[PDB]
C-alpha cells in the first residue's frame, strides 16, 4: 500500500517547493510464528500388545 500517486490535484511548474515526498515506503508489516506440539507416549506395561 504505497500508492504515492493519489489522484488529488495535478499542478506543477517543475519546482516551487516540489511535493517533497514523506517517505511513503517502509510501512512494512510483520507477524509472529506459532509452535505446535504433542506427544504419543506409550505406556510401560500396556505395550507390545496385539
Amino acid at each position: 500500500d504505497a500508492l504515492a500517486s493519489v489522484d488529488g490535484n495535478n499542478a506543477h511548474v517543475e519546482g516551487s517547493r516540489a511535493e517533497d515526498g514523506e517517505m511513503k515506503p517502509t510501512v512494512i508489516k510483520s507477524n509472529v510464528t506459532q509452535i505446535l506440539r504433542k506427544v504419543v507416549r506409550v505406556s510401560d506395561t500396556a505395550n507390545t500388545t496385539a
Binding site: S43, D44, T45, A46
Partner: protein
C-alpha cells in the same frame, strides 16, 4: 488402560509347579508339602509327597 501412564503392577507367568496341580500356595509359590487334588476324571493325583 486409561489415559494414565502406568496404572500397572508387577507381572509373572505360570510356573511349572503352578500349572500342573497347585495344591495350596505358601505365598507367591506353590506349597511343596501338600499333595495335589484328586482328579475328578479318574481320581488320580500327579503331586504326592509321601512320608
Amino acid at each position: 488402560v486409561a489415559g494414565l501412564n502406568d496404572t500397572h503392577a508387577a507381572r509373572k507367568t505360570g510356573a511349572f509347579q503352578f500349572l500342573c496341580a497347585h495344591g495350596g500356595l505358601a505365598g507367591g509359590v506353590v506349597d511343596k508339602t501338600k499333595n495335589g487334588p484328586a482328579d475328578p476324571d479318574t481320581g488320580a493325583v500327579t503331586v504326592k509327597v509321601a512320608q
